[PDB]
Design a binder for these strands. Structure first.
Ligand SMILES: [Mg+2]
Ligand SMILES: [Mg+2]
Ligand SMILES: [Mg+2]
Ligand SMILES: [Mg+2]
Ligand SMILES: [Mg+2]
Ligand SMILES: [Mg+2]
Ligand SMILES: [Mg+2]
Ligand SMILES: [Mg+2]
Ligand SMILES: [Mg+2]
Ligand SMILES: [Mg+2]
Ligand SMILES: [Mg+2]
Ligand SMILES: [Mg+2]
Ligand SMILES: [Mg+2]
Ligand SMILES: [Mg+2]
Ligand SMILES: [Mg+2]
Ligand SMILES: [Mg+2]
Ligand SMILES: [Mg+2]
Ligand SMILES: [Mg+2]
Ligand SMILES: [Mg+2]
Ligand SMILES: [Mg+2]
Ligand SMILES: [Mg+2]
Ligand SMILES: [Mg+2]
Ligand SMILES: [Mg+2]
Ligand SMILES: [Mg+2]
Ligand SMILES: [Mg+2]
Ligand SMILES: [Mg+2]
Ligand SMILES: [Mg+2]
Ligand SMILES: [Mg+2]
Ligand SMILES: [Mg+2]
Ligand SMILES: [Mg+2]
Ligand SMILES: [Mg+2]
Ligand SMILES: [Mg+2]
Ligand SMILES: [Mg+2]
Ligand SMILES: [Mg+2]
Ligand SMILES: [Mg+2]
Ligand SMILES: [Mg+2]
Ligand SMILES: [Mg+2]
Lengths: 87, 70, 101, 116
RNA sequence: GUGGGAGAGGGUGGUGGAAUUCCCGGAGUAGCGGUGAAAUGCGCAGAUACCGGGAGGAACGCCGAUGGCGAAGGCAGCCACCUGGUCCACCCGUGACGCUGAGGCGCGAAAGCGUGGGGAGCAAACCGGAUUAGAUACCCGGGUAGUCCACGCCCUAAACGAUGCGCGCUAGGUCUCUGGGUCUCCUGGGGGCCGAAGCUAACGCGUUAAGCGCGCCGCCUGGGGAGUACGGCCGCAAGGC
C-alpha cells in the first residue's frame, strides 16, 4: 500500500510551510514515492500491463510538474531534483 | 407468495456463517435465487451472492440439490 | 497489520487428546507467523450440506486474528499441511453490512 | 434370487431411447430394460410407447425378484421420459418418491458442434 | 490534501464443487449409440444403465441483468497478496502548472511461428459411414495439429457506436448503476429508451449530438485493374506496413 502516515512523512517533510498540502514540491514528492513503488512492482510482474500504463501516466505527470517548476523557479527546481535523485 | 427479505429481521448480509438465514435465499435446489424472488437491491443481491458462495465452500450450503415431485 | 478471520473444518470423529493436539498445533503455527489472536469460536459438530472427505459432517473452528499480510498466505499453506484439517478459509474482516434495518 | 422388497428405479431418457435400470436400496441394479430391449430397433426406440414398454418390462422383471415399493430417480429429457414414469406408475409397483436428478455441469466441457 | 465508495481493471500464488474422459472395484444382460431414416462405430475379453473409489485436464452453472470495469483488445467460482484507473463530499493546498499530438516507444481478439511442457472435451487436415445425378459439403462415427501453461515472435479484424481527443453552450420525459443530501424529491458521475430547438439525402441523431462553436491530430477526392505490381522497411516463416 501506501499507509496514511508514510504519506504524511513525505508531506510534512516536503511542504514550503506547515499546512501546505498541494504545492508543486509536495505533489512531485508524492508522485515520486508512488512511482518508485510501482517501478518496484513491475521489476517482478513484468506481465502486468495495465498497471504499467498507470506508470507511464504518473511519469508523464511528474515531468510536467517539473517542467513547470523549472520554468518558474530554477533554484527550487534544482532543490527538488537534488533532494529526490531524479532527471 | 411475496419476497424473501419480507420475512426476516435486520440481519447481516455479509455474514457467510449464518446458515439459518442463508438457506432462506437458496431455492428448492441450491440455486441462488433471482432478485425477483429475493426482493433485494442490486448491491444487496450482489453481496448476498458472494457471501453464499463463501458459505458453500465452507460446506454450510448446498452447491446443488435434487428435485422432489416431478 | 490487518484483521483476518480463520475458519477451520477438521475431522468430526476425533477423540480428545487428538483434537486438542490439532488445536495446540494450529495455535502453535499461528503464533509462529506473528499472528495475534483476538477472539475465538467453536461451533463444533455440524452437518455439512455435502460430504467433505467422504464424511457427512465436520468440526468447526472460527478464529479472529490480526497479522502480517506478507505471511497470511504462508499461514494458510501451513494450517493446510496438517492432515485431519479438511478446510481452511482465511478472510479479511469486514464491517457488518445489513438490510431490512 | 434376492428378495429385494423396496428398491431404486432409474429412468435414463435421451432423445434417442429410454432405459430403466432397477437397483436395491444401496444402489446395485437387479434388472434393466430399454426400447431396444424389447423389439424396437431404430428411431422408434425413443418413442414414448417404447418408454412405456420399457418401464413395464423392467417392472415385470422386478416383480419376479420380489419387489413392492420403489423410489424413482430420473435423468435426461426426451419424449416419454414422462410416459415412462406413467407406465411404471400403474405397474403394480407402489411409487414412493419421484425425483429429477439430471446432471448439469457448472461449465466444464466444450460441447460438440450440435450442442452449442 | 483529507474523508467516503463501487467494480468479472491487471499480475502472482492458493483452492472448491458440478460435468466429461479414463482406470480400479461391486452388481446386472444384450444391446448401446446414432439419424429424416440409416450405416460406419462400440458391446460376451461383459458394454450401455446403476453404485462406490482414484487420476487428469479444461471451464466456472444459479447469482446475471436490457448490469459492472477497462484506452482499446478485452475481463466472470472462492481466498489472499501486489497494483492501475475512477466517482462523490469537504472547498483545505499549489496558482494556468492547460488541450492536442507528425515521429518514437508501449499495449494489442483469434488464428499462425519457435523452444520446452501439458493434453480431459473439442476439433482444420485427415480416415471412415451416409445423402445426392456426383458429395471433395452439409448429417453420423473416429481423429492430428491446435486449443491449455511458460518464455520469445507475429501486429491483423465487421479491432464497430462502422461515429478521433478535449472544452463551452442549447427543453424535457422515462428506466437504470453508483455516490452525497435537509432522503416523496434534489444533486454529482456511468449505462439506456422516448423526445425541444436544431441537423440530416433519407434512415435517423438529438445534454452518452450526427445540434451550436473553438483547438489539435488522422483521413478522403469515380468503378474494375488492386490492397495487385515495383521499391523500401519490418518478420524465422506465414505475412505485415
Ligand atoms: Mg489437509
Ligand atoms: Mg434410436
Ligand atoms: Mg477482477
Ligand atoms: Mg484479478
Ligand atoms: Mg484458477
Ligand atoms: Mg470428478
Ligand atoms: Mg467394470
Ligand atoms: Mg449388432
Ligand atoms: Mg460384439
Ligand atoms: Mg467383437
Ligand atoms: Mg464414477
Ligand atoms: Mg491422463
Ligand atoms: Mg444468463
Ligand atoms: Mg483500487
Ligand atoms: Mg479555495
Ligand atoms: Mg488559495
Ligand atoms: Mg495566494
Ligand atoms: Mg494526450
Ligand atoms: Mg496479438
Ligand atoms: Mg493465439
Ligand atoms: Mg505453439
Ligand atoms: Mg468428438
Ligand atoms: Mg467424408
Ligand atoms: Mg464431426
Ligand atoms: Mg476501420
Ligand atoms: Mg471532426
Ligand atoms: Mg465507461
Ligand atoms: Mg444520466
Ligand atoms: Mg437520461
Ligand atoms: Mg431519439
Ligand atoms: Mg424537428
Ligand atoms: Mg460535444
Ligand atoms: Mg481509375
Ligand atoms: Mg493485407
Ligand atoms: Mg517503384
Ligand atoms: Mg517487396
Ligand atoms: Mg494474407
Amino acid at each position: 500500500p501506501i499507509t496514511k502516515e508514510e504519506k504524511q512523512k513525505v508531506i510534512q517533510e516536503f511542504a514550503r510551510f506547515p499546512g501546505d498540502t498541494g504545492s508543486t514540491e509536495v505533489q512531485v514528492a508524492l508522485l515520486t514515492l508512488r512511482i518508485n513503488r510501482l517501478s518496484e512492482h513491475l521489476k517482478v510482474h513484468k506481465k502486468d500491463h495495465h498497471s504499467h500504463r498507470g506508470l507511464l501516466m504518473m511519469v508523464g505527470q511528474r515531468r510536467r510538474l517539473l517542467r513547470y517548476l523549472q520554468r518558474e523557479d530554477p533554484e527550487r527546481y534544482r532543490a527538488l531534483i537534488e533532494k529526490l535523485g531524479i532527471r | 407468495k411475496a419476497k424473501v427479505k419480507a420475512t426476516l429481521g435486520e440481519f447481516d448480509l455479509r455474514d457467510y456463517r449464518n446458515v439459518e438465514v442463508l438457506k432462506r435465499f437458496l431455492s428448492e435446489t441450491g440455486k441462488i435465487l433471482p432478485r425477483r424472488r429475493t426482493g433485494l437491491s442490486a448491491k444487496e443481491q450482489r453481496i448476498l451472492a458472494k457471501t453464499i458462495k463463501r458459505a458453500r465452500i465452507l460446506g454450510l450450503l448446498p452447491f446443488t440439490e435434487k428435485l422432489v415431485r416431478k | 497489520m490487518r484483521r483476518y478471520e480463520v475458519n477451520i473444518v477438521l475431522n468430526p470423529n476425533l477423540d480428545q487428546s487428538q483434537l486438542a493436539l490439532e488445536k495446540e498445533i494450529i495455535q502453535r503455527a499461528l503464533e509462529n507467523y506473528g499472528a495475534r489472536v483476538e477472539k475465538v469460536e467453536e461451533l463444533g459438530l455440524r452437518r455439512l450440506a455435502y460430504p467433505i472427505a467422504k464424511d457427512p459432517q465436520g468440526y468447526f473452528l472460527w478464529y479472529q486474528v490480526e497479522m502480517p499480510e506478507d505471511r497470511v498466505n504462508d499461514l494458510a499453506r501451513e494450517l493446510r499441511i496438517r492432515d485431519n484439517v479438511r478446510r481452511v478459509m482465511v478472510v479479511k474482516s469486514q464491517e457488518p453490512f445489513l438490510a431490512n434495518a | 434370487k434376492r428378495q429385494v422388497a423396496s428398491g431404486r428405479a432409474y429412468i435414463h431418457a435421451s432423445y434417442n431411447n429410454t432405459i430403466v435400470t432397477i437397483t436395491d436400496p444401496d444402489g446395485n441394479p437387479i434388472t434393466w430394460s430399454s426400447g431396444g430391449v424389447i423389439g424396437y430397433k431404430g428411431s422408434r426406440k425413443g418413442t414414448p410407447y417404447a418408454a412405456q414398454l420399457a418401464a413395464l418390462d423392467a417392472a415385470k422383471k422386478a416383480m419376479a425378484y420380489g419387489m413392492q415399493s420403489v423410489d424413482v430417480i430420473v435423468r435426461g429429457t426426451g419424449a416419454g421420459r414422462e410416459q415412462a414414469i406413467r407406465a411404471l406408475q400403474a405397474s403394480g409397483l407402489q411409487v414412493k418418491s419421484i425425483v429429477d436428478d439430471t446432471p448439469v455441469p457448472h461449465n466444464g466441457c466444450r460441447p460438440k458442434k450440435k450442442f452449442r
